[PDB]
Amino acid sequence: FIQTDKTIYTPGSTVLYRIFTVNHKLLPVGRTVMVNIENPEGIPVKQDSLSSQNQLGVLPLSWDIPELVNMGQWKIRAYYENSPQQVFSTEFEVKEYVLPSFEVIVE
Amino acid sequence: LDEDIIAEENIVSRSEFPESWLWNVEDLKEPPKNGISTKLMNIFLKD
Amino acid sequence: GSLVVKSGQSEDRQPVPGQQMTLKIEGDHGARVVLVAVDKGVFVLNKKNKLTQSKIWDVVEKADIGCTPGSGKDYAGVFSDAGLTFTSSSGQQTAQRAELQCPQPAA
């Protein structure tokens, strides 16, 4: 399970994401995880290889988004080293935005 | 200064405007009661 | 288990920028809790791809080996349609399963 602090990011900021490692019983486990980050056009730019060993099934990570980069839908793909075929992914949008001051609901 | 107002030198502007904070990690090792621990955190709200 | 996050102040109203506030956390003993605070204004631009406990169970259920609400055509079908395999010294065994995914939902 991948968790990102925000849902959308601006070019230049930092993305804080944690990877939760558990078994079929949802209980934490220490394994080797391969984490990649692809751009809108499906092109990996950063790849890590950390282990949740003695980390209580929580892998804190972070990556800085360069100013010069394509906007759109980004994806973070992670998978256990013992099963490359099974991949988990979570998307985060990159766009030049500015936080509004009010929300709008359409019901 | 004597006016019924606050001078410019006395107005501390708000600058801390984060979009996401409190990226912390806390463990619940406190004395359990009914299988439910309780940690009291003292956070510092932003501007 | 259970994880609840409420206001430490069992009284008063809304705080003021820069002011401190107690944050009560009621969780299971020995459990580690990771926190994160985000301005609601962000979700106005994007509320998708978040992390919810409901989304977790939705994944677990999809990875179920059972492909039938119950019962079966025969005794060898009841077990197989429930995610099990029966084999005896008398000869009575279940239907050979050699496919990962459940039956292709044939409407």
UniProtKB/Swiss-Prot annotation, chain A:
UniProt protein name: Complement C3 beta chain
Protein species of origin? Homo sapiens
From Swiss-Prot, chain B:
What name goes with this protein?
Answer: Complement C3c alpha' chain fragment 1
Q: Which gene encodes it?
A: C3
Say which residues of the entire protein are included here: 751 to 797 of 1663
